[PDB]
Design a protein around this ligand. Structure first.
Ligand SMILES: N[C@@H](Cc1ccccc1)C(=O)O
Ligand SMILES: N[C@@H](Cc1ccccc1)C(=O)O
Ligand SMILES: N[C@@H](Cc1ccccc1)C(=O)O
Ligand SMILES: N[C@@H](Cc1ccccc1)C(=O)O
Lengths: 300, 300, 300, 300
C-alpha cells in the first residue's frame, strides 16, 4: 500500500539558506542600514522617538528594474524627511530562482541605505532574507496562528500583526502579548536541515489597523484600539494601513494627518501602497503631508 | 553588526524524518489499518457508507501506558460497533525524544488494527507521522491560514477544518474549497532538507463544528451549515466536536444522537474527549448511544 | 556545456548515519563489550597485558545466520580462553540495505559479548559502524595513503597497518608514526552533512605482517621488523596475519606458537581466516595452540 | 560508555558544494575552456593529436595575487605555443574560506582561457572544484588505493596515476586498468549529503613517471614502461614528471626533448614545477624546447 505522499505531485530540494547567504552576503552598509532601521523603529514604537514609521511600496514587485528605480527615488525622500519620518520600502512578492531574485533585490536596496520591509507568511522563508529585513507584517489570516506568533517571537526585527479580516482587534492584542514570550517552533537551520528553534521573545511587536469589516482608521477606532492595548498591559503603539480594506488612500492620509496634528502620539506608523496603488506624484504629496503632521504633533 | 538570529536562544538539528521511519517502520498491518481507515472515512464523508466516523480520545497523551491501555479497550469497541461506527483514536500531544515516543505510540496502536487521528499545527511535523494518520484536524486558529490550507491540499488523509473561534463558518467553507486545488508550500524532505512541496489537491476535506461564542451543534445550526455548504457547491458532510467551546459533552451526545435518529444523513462524524474529559464508563455509554442512533438512521 | 558528472551514472542519497544509529542503537551490553575490548587490546599492544589479541573470522560474511552461528561458537572459546587470548571476530563484507544488515549483525554480535573487528576502506562508512568496532585494519594498498593515516588518527579503536603488497615494512612504520599525530580530513557528520574532522591522534596503532614477495612471519622477519620499529622510536608491537600472502595457516600458527613459547613478547596479535580458510575443528585447534604458547611465554 | 568520537577533537559542517557553485558559478568562458581542454587532452592521450600535454605550475599556491600573475604570463605562452603544446596550469593547495579562495582562483583562471590541473587526495573535495578541472593526478601514495581508483573511474577529466614511491610501475598499470571499469564509492551530493556514487569508468587515464629509488625518465625506462602498457593491452601513453624524485629539471627536459625529437610518440605529456622549482626565465626555455621537440617529432 502507498500511504505516503499520495497527494504530493512533486517535492524538490530547495537551496539551503546558506547557499543564498554565500551568493548574496550582506555588505557592511546593508548590515548597518538594517541594524539602524530596526533600532529606529524600536525607538519610535516605544515613544523615545517622535517620528513616524512609514512602510511604503508597490502592491507587489513584478519587475526588478522598476523596483530599483522606485528605490532610488524613495531613498532621496527618506533622506530629506528623516527628521519627521523613518521611511522603509515594502518589498512583497523555479523557486530557487525566485529566492535568488528576491535576496538580490533586498541586498541591493539595503546596500543603497534604504531599509526594507516584508510579509512573513511561513516559518522557512525568513531563513533566506530576514538578515535584510528591518520590519515585517504577519497577515490578518495568520495573526491567530500559533506558529506565526511563535515565529514573531524569534524574529530579529519588529513585527506588525494585522487585525482579523472582519475587524477583530483581540487576535492582534493576544498575538502581541504572545510574541513577547519565549517559544518553540519547527523550521530549518541555515544549512537547510529540519530544526527546533527556541526563541527569546520579541518586545517589538505592535498592531496594524487594516480595516476588517469597517475602516478602523477613525480617531474613535484608534481610541478603542489604544484602550484595548492599554487594558492588556501593552504600549499603545499603532500602525495604520492606508490600503487593503481601509479602501481613498488620500482621504485616509488626510484623516490620519489630522489625528497626528491634534497630538495623537499613539499612532507610530502607517502603510502606503505606491506604484510607478497611488502614483509617484501623489506619493511625494502624501509623505510631505504626514511629515507636516509629525512636526505639528511635536508642538500641539 | 550582528543582525542574524538576535532573538534565537538556541537552534538544534531535529532528527530527519527518515530517522524515525527507519527506527519505527509501518508493519504490513499498520499500513493496512491506515489505508482502510482513510478509504472508509472517504466513503462515509461522501455518503456511500451510512456509518458515522468517531474521533475519540484523551484531551492529551500524558503517559503512553495509559494511552496503550485506552487503545486496547477502544479497539474492542471499534470491533463490536464496526457495523455502525468507524472508530479512530485521537492521539494528541527533548523534541527528538518526543518524536520517538509519538511515532512509536502511533505505530503500536495502528499495528493493533486501531486507526489514529491527529492535529496538524505545522508543515514540518507531518513528515514524521502522517504515514500513520488516518485523519487530522486543522484548528480553529489556522483554518483561515493559507499555509494550512496548502498543507491540507497535500496530505494523504481526510482533513477537518474547524470553524473560527467566534463561530464563523465561512473560513472552513473557503478552506475546504481551497484544499481541493493544487498548491505549493515549504517544508522538508524525508531526508530533512528544505523543500518545495507541490500538492495534487485533497477532495476529502469537511467542516468540524466546535462551537464559538455560543454552541453550534443544535439542529438549526446544522441546518444553516448544511445550506451554507450546499450553496457553496460542496457535499453537505458535517462533523460535530462535542468538546471545546460546545462545552455537557453527554448532553451534546444526546442532542446529536437525536438528529441522527431523526434521519440526518448530513452529520457524518463526531469528536469526543475521553480519559481513564469523561470517564471510560461514560465513554462506552455514548458510543453505544451513537451506534443506536446510526442503526435507527438506517431505517427511516 | 555539460562539464559536471559526465562519468557519474547515478548518485543517490545514502541514509545519514543517524538513521542507522536510531534504528540499531548500541545496547548497554554492546557498548560495554566494545569499551572493554578496546581497552584490553590497548593493554596488550603496549605490553601491560601478556595475552595475545586474536582477530579471527570468515573470509567474508555472505550469510548472516551462518555468521551468527559462528559467533555463538567463537564466543564460548573467547570465554574459556580469556586468561590467555583476547578473541575478536572479524566481520568483513542496495547499499542502504547493506548498511542495515551490517550494523544489525555487528550489534547482535556485540550484544552477545563478542567484540568485532573490521577493515576501513573509506572515510565515510566508519560513521555507520565504528561505535561497534573494537579494532580495524588499513589494508596493504592504503597503508601509504594520507587519507587513511588521517582516518586512523581519528578512530576510536586500535588500528593495524598491513605492510605493503611487496613486503615493504617502512610504509607501516611511517603510517604508525603519522597516525599518532593530529590531522584533518573531509567526511560527514552523524547527520550526513559534508564535514571537516579534526583528530587528536591515535597511539594505538601497530604493524600487521601479512607477507609480500615471500612470507614474512618467521623469527628473522620478526626480528628485523622489531628492530625497524625500535629504531623509529616505536613500541615493538607486532601482529602476524596467518592468511593472505603468508599462504599453511596452521604451519604459520605452529611457527608463531614457537616464537611465543621461546619468549617473544613483541608478538602481540595474530589474524586467522576461518569458516563454517580453515574449518571449525582446525579453528579450535589453533586457538588452543596459541593459548598454550601464551601460557608458556609467561613462564620463561 | 563513551565509545563515539573519542579521538575527534572537533567536527564541523563544511559548506555544501552547492554553496560554492552558487557563489562562484562557471562563466560561459570557464565552462568552454574546461570542455575544450579536456577534449584536447583526451585527443593527445590516445594519439589523435601530436601535441604534448604540459602540466606546469607552482609547487603550491600560497598567494593568489602571485598565482594570477603567473597565470597571465603562462596564458600568453599557452596561446603562442598552442600548435605544439597543450598547456595547463597546475593549481595545488578555515577550510570553508580555503574552499572559497580555491574555487574563486580556479574560476578566474579558467575564465581567462587557461585550463587548470589539480591533485585528488580525497573523494569529497572534487565536488567543490572538479567542474573547473581539466586534468588531475592521483599521487604515488594513493595509486594503489581502491577508493582512489574508484574516484578516477567517475571523474569528468583525464587522470594520471603516478608510479609508486619506490619506482613500481605495476600499480599504475593496474590503476589504469581498474579506473576504466564502473565502480561505486561513498561521498556527498552537491547538496552535501552522504551518497553512493556509481561511476561509468574513465578510459582517459595514463601513467605519470615521477621517479622512485632512481630516476625513471630515460629512454630505456620509457621503453620498459611502454612495453608493460602494451602487454597489458593499454595505450602506450606516458607522462613524465620532471620534478619530485626525478630530481636537474632542465637536464630532464633535455633528455626528454631528445626522445621526442628521435620520434617517440608514446611520450604524450610532461609535468614541470615552476614559480616566478625553476624560475620564470627557465620556464619559458623548457616550454619552447619541448615545443621544438614536438615540431621535430612531426617530421621524423
Ligand atoms: N533567521 C530569523 C529567525 C528564524 C530562524 C529560524 C527559522 C525562522 C526564523 C531572523 O534572524 O529573524
Ligand atoms: N507526507 C504528507 C505530505 C507532506 C509531505 C511533505 C511535507 C509535508 C507534508 C502526507 O503523506 O500527508
Ligand atoms: N566515528 C569514528 C571517527 C570518524 C568520524 C567521522 C568520519 C570518520 C571517522 C570513530 O568514532 O572512531
Ligand atoms: N563531480 C566529479 C565526480 C564526483 C561526484 C561525486 C563525488 C566525487 C566526485 C566530476 O564531475 O568529475
Amino acid at each position: 500500500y502507498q500511504n505516503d505522499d499520495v497527494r504530493v505531485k512533486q517535492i524538490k530540494e530547495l537551496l539551503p539558506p546558506i547557499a543564498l547567504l554565500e551568493k548574496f552576503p550582506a555588505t557592511d552598509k546593508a548590515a548597518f542600514t538594517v541594524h539602524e532601521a530596526r533600532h529606529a523603529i524600536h525607538n519610535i514604537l516605544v515613544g523615545k522617538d517622535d517620528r513616524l514609521v512609514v512602510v511604503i511600496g508597490p502592491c507587489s514587485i513584478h519587475d526588478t528594474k522598476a523596483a530599483l528605480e522606485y528605490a532610488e527615488r524613495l531613498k532621496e525622500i527618506r533622506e530629506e524627511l528623516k527628521d519627521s519620518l523613518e521611511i522603509v520600502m515594502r518589498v512583497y512578492f523555479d523557486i530557487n530562482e525566485g529566492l535568488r531574485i528576491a535576496r538580490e533585490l533586498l541586498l541591493t536596496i539595503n546596500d543603497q541605505g534604504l531599509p526594507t520591509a516584508g510579509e512573513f507568511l511561513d516559518v522557512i522563508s525568513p531563513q533566506y532574507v530576514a538578515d535584510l529585513m528591518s520590519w515585517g507584517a504577519i497577515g490578518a489570516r495568520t495573526t491567530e496562528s500559533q506558529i506565526h506568533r511563535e515565529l514573531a517571537s524569534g524574529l530579529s526585527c519588529p513585527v506588525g500583526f494585522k487585525n482579523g479580516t472582519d475587524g477583530t482587534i483581540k487576535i492582534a492584542i493576544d498575538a502581541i502579548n504572545s510574541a513577547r514570550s519565549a517559544h518553540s517552533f519547527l523550521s530549518v537551520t541555515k544549512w537547510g536541515h529540519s530544526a527546533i528553534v527556541n526563541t527569546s521573545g520579541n518586545p517589538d511587536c505592535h498592531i496594524i489597523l487594516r480595516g476588517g469589516k469597517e475602516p478602523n482608521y477613525s480617531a474613535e477606532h484608534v481610541k478603542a484600539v489604544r484602550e484595548g492595548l492599554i487594558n492588556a498591559g501593552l504600549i499603545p503603539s499603532i500602525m495604520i494601513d492606508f490600503s487593503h480594506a481601509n479602501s481613498k488612500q488620500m482621504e485616509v492620509a488626510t484623516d490620519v494627518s489630522t489625528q497626528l496634528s491634534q497630538g495623537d502620539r499613539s499612532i507610530t506608523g502607517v502603510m502606503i501602497e505606491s506604484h510607478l496603488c497611488i502614483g509617484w506624484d501623489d506619493t511625494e504629496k502624501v509623505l510631505r503631508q504626514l511629515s507636516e503632521a509629525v512636526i505639528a504633533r511635536r508642538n500641539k
